[PDB]
Symmetry: C5
Subunit: 310 residues, 5 copies
């Protein structure tokens, strides 16, 4: 097997689409191996740029094709370069730009942590014909910077693993295992936008639905509470436009459902209090003493959720 030393430089990470759980990575990939010694012009390394490597490949040069595994579509390669040394080592440098994909877990959606994963693998050569010795990832242009709502924390984690493929077992009986490189870059979401944009107005709506209990007439207590309840119900598909149609509820979705239950319980309570007015003149005080307890119960539920979930 040949020892291929890979260096990946990440130019920028952009286009993080959480609706499709994809992201776009820009940068250069440098793959280095050693072959037979050759004669170059002078005693200087020879640089073979793009649309000239194919002449060397037709002449008989061994340049392996390294593919990215977790891409959607195909990586849009740009300029590519081949460097040949008189001592006999070949360096393949190319620029990639592809839409990678990774599984994302949105339980704690405003305060969420995922990672961006690049997976590299030879297309045709197994570990008995091509081995990855090591990878150094040079991530300093995005080391501590803020992609539009994501913070990059820590350095990139590298790993080399061998992946066994059973669809190549018929064509390769005992040698169908492929060397792989995984590069993981941790990202932490910035919750500031949601804090000033969705939690702040919805908190004020729920505060108004708390303060409707202080009114002295049934019609004002009823129609304004219905208006606020329908306003909170109108926020149902807020998450589904940012994220996908996930089968689970986030913090924001749970807060919206808590708003549903709060204002619906308020409506049911005031309707029951009006129904208990059998003669139209009896007024209840114990069932209307909840003007402080009901927001206190909401805050208790909120703080228990904050303590337990985080």
């Amino acid at each position: 097997p040949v020892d291929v030393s890979v260096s990946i430089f990440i130019n920028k990470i952009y286009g993080v689409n959480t609706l499709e759980q994809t992201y776009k990575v820009d940068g250069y990939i440098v793959a280095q191996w050693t072959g037979k010694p050759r004669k170059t012009p002078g005693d200087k390394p020879l640089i073979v740029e793009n649309t000239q490597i194919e002449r060397w490949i037709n002449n008989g040069l061994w340049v392996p094709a390294l593919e990215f595994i977790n891409v959607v579509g195909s990586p849009d390669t740009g300029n590519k370069r081949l460097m040949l040394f008189p001592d006999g080592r070949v360096i393949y440098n190319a620029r990639f730009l592809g839409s990678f994909s990774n599984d994302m877990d949105f339980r704690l959606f405003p305060f969420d942590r995922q990672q961006f994963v690049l997976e590299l693998e030879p297309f045709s050569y197994n570990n008995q014909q091509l081995r990855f010795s090591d990878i150094q990832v040079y991530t300093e242009n995005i080391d501590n910077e803020e992609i539009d709502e994501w913070w990059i924390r820590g350095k990139a984690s590298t790993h080399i693993s061998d992946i066994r493929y059973d669809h190549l077992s018929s064509v390769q009986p005992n040698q169908n295992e492929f060397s792989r490189i995984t590069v993981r870059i941790d990202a932490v979401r910035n919750p500031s936008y949601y804090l000033w944009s969705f939690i702040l107005p919805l908190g004020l709506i729920i505060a108004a639905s708390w303060s409707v209990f202080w009114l002295e007439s049934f019609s004002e207590r009823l129609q304004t509470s219905f208006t606020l309840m329908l306003t909170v119900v109108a926020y149902a598909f807020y998450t589904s436009n940012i994220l996908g149609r996930l089968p689970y509820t986030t913090y924001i979705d749970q807060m919206i459902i808590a708003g549903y239950g709060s204002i619906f319980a308020a409506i049911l309570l005031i309707i029951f209090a009006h129904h208990r007015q059998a003669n139209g003149v009896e007024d209840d005080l114990l069932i209307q003493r909840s003007r402080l307890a009901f927001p206190l119960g909401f805050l208790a539920i909120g703080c228990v959720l904050v303590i337990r979930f985080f």
Copy 2:
């Protein structure tokens, strides 16, 4: 005819667009046949990577082109490989990525079952010149996993059939029949999102439209019922943004229409009860005793629909 043995490995399934009834399938296709014996470097199989197969094709190698039938657009192939054996068998390995299409049936839309179908066929060779012997599909990366709202259940079903084409009857008189491979992967939709996102708020809206009957004034019974009816009518195009403009009603569409009929019948009933107040003082009790029967009728209709339809 030549015996071509196909192995399809499914990398991932993503981008299931039910509005256009398309989906994207990633993976590799391995096609193997046997030809004449040849001389390779040493006694080892020879690997011919991409942009080098065309040299062998120009030299006179027979590499058939297998196309995908049910794609929209063209499949975006990536790296492709050719493996030549000294015993005389040729293996064509390539990576595909295309937007396939299949007919989908959305009667039971939240609790729906479709399948993802890959159809493979030679472009130019009939069954008298190219036969498909067998296909083994290796589907373990998506075996029991959850695509964004779909569950993959069971193993992939394979079938080999011969398809007769009448547009090739003039150019091929008695031999216009083509061998085909169909790969079917069953998928079951996850109804959790709709259960907590659309059925839960709409159920509470219909519960409020039930509870409006307990009010003691006509204006409160009228304007709140009109507001809830218009709120339910505003949910008319909810399905048409997820699915297409289907000619049939789903479970969700039938529930929305049931909400229409429920709140409209409530409005008609309270208007008729107000109109029967000829002197402005007579109050009706039999026509207003439906405060428990009307939700009971709605629940009876719902449970009969659940029992009969499922």
Copy 3:
């Protein structure tokens, strides 16, 4: 001139975008002509697949280029095949996939009839150098099936016509006329979706705006009528999202405008009836006897429109 016999097989029709009046057609095109006799391997027809026809074209084979006239963008061709016979006839088979365009006429929009037109023409050869003898269209995969809201009725109509071009008159003095093939496939829209999705809720809204006349108070007659009128006005851009910004009104647009006029005339009538209450106690009966006539007038206008327009 050479006699070119064309056979077009339609695989599927999809992506009917009425906003841009385009549609996507999949299938294969088979063009057959006769040339000089040639020697093939054995006495069997020779199949030349893709990226190998150019070798024969460089050697001196005459393969004309047939273009599609009414496409938007360029047709995304896939595999293409060339078949050569020892008797001396050449068959060019290729797969096309393009976004065709045709003029559409949306007067009777829910109950609408357009056709899908494929226009084929040589790019460079006039009728004195290339003639189309006949075309047989093989349309059985979409013969009687339902594209998402369209029904295919009847068989495809074929026509061969000669088209004269005046921009080639300077470069070709008396021979600037080009043979053409037009393939027309009739389509009938399914009105079921609009019937259960837009006509059914809007009919109930107009029925409520009819039933507001039975109320015994001016404020209830006024604010609910204003709410229903604004609800109907909110449906103004419903057609412009499905179709384009057409200069004419459809059935649905005319029904929406009839809703405008109905509820606005109701508002004007109740305001005039309130204004005639000079002393605040006189009640009018003749001007409020229209509770049955006004929906009867709406139904009369509707049935006259249905009889005359259809």
Copy 4:
């Protein structure tokens, strides 16, 4: 310099996107010049189709590259043809399809007039090496027809001008001037859709806000006026979805702002009239005699704007 005679045939104009001020033009371009006499097969002109012109260019044929200046992206060329005459004239015919761009001026937006401009220029040859003699534009497929909301009026205007480039002054000292062709096709917008779709409902909303003054109670005069004012305010971004975010107001935007001012002045006037009721029983007649003057003032402002602006 060589004399190049250009003929442009416009197939169709489609996709007029006023949000980005681009449009798509389909058609063929015929460029004719004269060179040295040559020998063709027989005494007949020789037609060289696509992917065969490059052989003649490698052999030493001078085929200049004409580029389009005002395109966004690159023009998607289709089939291209080369015609060679024994007398020694070369004709280059090709089909283009590109997204052109032009500056648009939306002051009189419903009744607006722009033009579609095609600009053609050699890429590398100045006026001392390539001159454009004349252009004839053959525009009969779109001569008097209606693109989706645009009317083509008059014939296309042609102009030949020389454009001087200062970025080529260092590489070409005294000869950096390039011949150009501009083709202008006037277009007039159809205002029918906006007339029946936006002016008609907004006119009825403003008429209702006029008729609210006839009500005899302050609450009905206030809440309905607020509802209509908020309805008119909701139409603020109607233009920004059709056109761009233009720094100027159109006719429709000015009508919406006039609706703002009208209903806000009505609200201020009724609030001031209620505030002048110091004892709660005094009624004002002079300040409420504006029920005919205020719509008369609105109509006077409208007719002065119509007379002066048009």
Copy 5:
């Protein structure tokens, strides 16, 4: 090292997408260096157009590849030209069209200033093998013109810097530093559209929420204030559709939050004033004397923000 003199001509700047912080730049790039003297046809410079430079590169011509650093995707190059002089200087002229990217800072969003940055760099040659001598940018087509909401002010600023890459340190031990060109074009946003489209209606909404204090009844003061507060809350995601989901508040976002606080404080104040009516007849004057102070406080906050922030 070779001295490469670059001239960049900017044709147009369009498609400024502030949601993704990208923009599209059209124009031509002229790169000039000097090599060995050569023989041309005659004593005239030789122009080598596109798809003919590769013949010279295969023959052994040194044409370096200059890439753009800050692009998203790949630049869509069009025609490219090579000019060879008998004195021995090579000029590479090409047309580029790419979607560049730059960091944007939206604190003062309506009155905002960013710049458009083009970064050019060799792909494979360091400063010891290729130096950039100078760049002249010819920006007269966009010198003082208005891109759709941006004004170009001043002339373009040019800079030449050397960039050190640590991912090439293993393959190039002491020479891994690359020469770069940065071209900066200042842009100033036009705030007119937002001034007449969002600040003008929202200012009138806040003025109405000021004027609700003059009403003499609690229900009119309450329901209209709630309607205006919900209307202002509905404007929460106005910025997120133009810009991104930024973690900071702009001028418009701060004005919307000030509207939240203003109308919520008005609602709390009127509810507290109603609650202080213990007997239902006592009226407060000091707490309702704020009808002039509360808008005065809002204007004071606004003018302090205008003075301090600007």
